[PDB]
Amino acid sequence: MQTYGNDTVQYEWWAGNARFADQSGLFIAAHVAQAALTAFWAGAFTLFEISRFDPTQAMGDQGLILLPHLATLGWGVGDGGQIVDTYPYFVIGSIHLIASAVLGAGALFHTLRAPADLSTLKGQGKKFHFTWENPQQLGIILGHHLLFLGAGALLLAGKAMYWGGLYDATTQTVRLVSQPTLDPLVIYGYQTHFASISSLEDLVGGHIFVGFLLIGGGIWHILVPPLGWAKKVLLFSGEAILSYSLGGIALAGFVAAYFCAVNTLAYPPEFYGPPLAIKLGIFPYFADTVELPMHAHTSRAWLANAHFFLAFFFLQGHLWHALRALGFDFKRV
Amino acid sequence: KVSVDNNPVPTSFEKWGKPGHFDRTLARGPKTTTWIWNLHANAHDFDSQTSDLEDVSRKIFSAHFGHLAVVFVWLSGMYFHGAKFSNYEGWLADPTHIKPSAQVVWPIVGQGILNGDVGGGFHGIQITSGLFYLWRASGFTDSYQLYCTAIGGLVMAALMLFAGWFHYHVKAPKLEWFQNVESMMNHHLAGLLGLGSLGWAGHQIHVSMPINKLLDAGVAPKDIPLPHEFILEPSKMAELYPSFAQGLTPFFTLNWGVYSDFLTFKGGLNPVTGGLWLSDTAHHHLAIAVLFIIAGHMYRTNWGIGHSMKEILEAHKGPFTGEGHKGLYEILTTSWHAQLAINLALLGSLTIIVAQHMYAMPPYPYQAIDYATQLSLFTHHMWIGGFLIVGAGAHGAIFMVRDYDPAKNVNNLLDRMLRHRDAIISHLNWVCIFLGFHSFGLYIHNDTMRALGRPQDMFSDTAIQLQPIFAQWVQHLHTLAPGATAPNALATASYAFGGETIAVAGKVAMMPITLGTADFMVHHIHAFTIHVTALILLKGVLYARSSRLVPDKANLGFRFPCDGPGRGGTCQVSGWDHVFLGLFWMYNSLSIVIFHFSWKMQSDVWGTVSPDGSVTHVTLGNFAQSAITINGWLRDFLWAQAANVINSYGSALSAYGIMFLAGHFVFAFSLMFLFSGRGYWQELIESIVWAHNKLNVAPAIQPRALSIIQGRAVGVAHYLLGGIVTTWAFFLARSLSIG
């Protein structure tokens, strides 16, 4: 945390989450509670949208955002979005509820049983202590997180190839994908037509490449510490690593709002609704090409407009925190 | 702002078994029977019990919670009787043929004859409270829904009882919490009245309007959709009102004319039911909520913006008025009795306004054709508002005796009121003699002229006319109001001003009320009798402290008999005795108000409707020729319309015949207390005490005659108990019989 020259700042209650920025034990307890709250929303609102689901009406014109995500993976849908099973939606949404309860327990564990600093602990709990000064420990945290993020892309592809199989828009039938792409020259070409992908096998082979690059990226951060040039050009403080991550998650949310609005393969029109056109009034909002009954918009519009506005303010939050890291006081102006 | 004291009073039953502990002169136990009466009279006199204003305010706060628990238990009982012992499901199917009934008597000693045939095979007391019309306007369909309100009423009463124990015995607020009147007015306008009007507008839009629109369409009550089904599925709500497909977006974007199908300024009455349109009332409650929430942001609080009420009052000085309202803020934040005098004046004025608004703009379905409900709701809210107005003159006089500090009242509005008491009262004395001569003497004149066989010399519409030309012009302006001065109103505010006659069950809901010479004379009778009731009570407030007769009445108290037989006799000089005399004159005022209401409704409004459109009234238009004369009031109102209360014996209305004679007794019983006096009764009791001392059965608690104030208090209680129970039995037996 950048406290400038004062170095001991009372943070009151409206900015009360800056107090544990130097406290490593309470840093875990907040973040696992966020992962508990995120897994709870994935758990409760899957089952909320199962109860508010009419299988006669299409999923796009129902305000349902989680069930089309599982339907693209191949659960619960036979051929054309009619949703004939709807039990694996319940099982996946049930698993996230207990997973939220375990992460809800570990948040309350690290708040109370574990100390506010991990330097008090002895054994492996001492080795999990981190601060915003040593570069090697932050690369250790970044190394394992890239390994599980790479494993998530591989277990996406393992679901997409061996057991399960995704959903294709054209020739509407759940596939198995036995021959994905593996050529680097045809996966390098998607820097200009990433939104207009229409091959299910190319999406898997990109995720094989991403799931191997992030595992290799996580191996590189766990065997090599951060170098001198990365230490010079990047501030390693509390709300500076957050600043790079807020801008990193803002660029991801702009791409995800772009992939939701116009791609037809990863977001099929049988589940989300017809693809959108990029409009721009006072803000770049994604509008529906075809009108809908009442003021209800399709599920693809409700996802793309929410994620663009979230990626805008998480870019503004990156600009707020990076200015705080660089030394702008914000009471000067 | 929030400052409480932790456990000021312990919770124990030690003072429960020690009555009279609150008063210093009653904690010694009884010696005479006056102790028992003084125990009851001083029980709620918290300012006399406690010198500390902070502990007085803590007693008042928890007493409200106990009083609210009484009201919720009473509210739970009305909803429980509507759930378990009522034909509400029977009445909801056929409102035009089944009479409302919610009380079933036990069949013993012949009293089961009171369970009359109210239609549909149900037998019970025919209720006139209008609860069935209130519940149909609330969307009540099943008896389980009234049972759930009755259980939640008992839950709210238990929370009211818990909050009274908590805020007196556990966490009692400090005096500065009570004296923050700017925060209290902000939370009562915006949070109590504003959110209550916004919640009821939300209830009316979502529950009351879809159920009542289907009930008026002809859907059976078993086939009405449930209130949450409109909340859950908006398809049924969009079928009734297609603006709900647009959602809340026209509200937030100021496109408010989308909602004009269910938020109407329609006016008039619903022809199906005879009540107000619930599209109007939901739009009424929405507009009332916005203005009340806006008005609840007026006063200064922790965030700097707002008004200080001290700076508003001290700015409002004038050339005629000296230092103006300076010091009224210190009066109204220190004296609880001064605040109660204003609140009783305006709640009593409100309850009268409620009575005069619910007959001519009937808000409930099928209330206007229930002539018993229309007569009772006017009369009950007249009488309730009458007592509260007399209590304003009471606690105005209690403030002047007790809480009036002349040190902080120098040349302000209250000091200058005291400095021209002879100017106010004697001019109010003059206007009462003028109005009594020029309203009642008009009645005496044409009573005499009709007795002398001179109808041309009378004050009537056939003779020398006294037309209410200013009220006829105001009635004409309201008839011309839709399209000219209320252009978005499709109908008039009330059909009482003029226009359409509304028929529901072949029966007049609302009719034009034509004001003639008889309506002129009775309005000046009302102007006369209100002025005298204003005269006695303002003389009680102004001369509470002193007069030319007794200059030290402030030391004598608020509630004292007299200052002896000297100075000719100073009998009933106290501030209390003007409340005692004002209670009679409120009874005399309001009895003529409800008698004017009862006759003018039956003669000129209420009645049956011909299929061609003609109206045959109940008493056939005898107001214009007989309400100009005292004998016509005696013959064509009192004698004629009480034939239903005296021929009711052997029928379901025989309890009204019993209660008619019951109120005749207690009125006559009052005159024993009013005309006699306690020095007679003390000398009679000591002769009876001798006969008890003869048998060794003289009590240790010595028998005393009642005190002089009590003999006035018992006499005024029995007079107004007896005279009102008589009128209640007369009104209810007559109006249940007609129609």
């Binding site: 102006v333 | 100021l254 408010w256 004319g257 922790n302 965030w303 700097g304 913006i305």
Partner: protein, 77 residues
Amino acid sequence: VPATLSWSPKVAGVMIACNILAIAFGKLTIKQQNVGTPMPSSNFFGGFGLGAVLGTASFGHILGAGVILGLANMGVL
């Protein structure tokens, strides 16, 4: 029924101008502009607190509701 229009930048332009006219009214006429909870930045608000910022924007929405519905009733908007 009085005429009302849907939302537009013309409707937003009148509302912001009604907020501006009440901000200038609140700058001139509020006796206690910084009492209680202050703003995160006292500058760019005329020294207003949280109560004065919310007080003037609420008046500018009351004037915003009154003018916009008044002009739509007359057909100006």
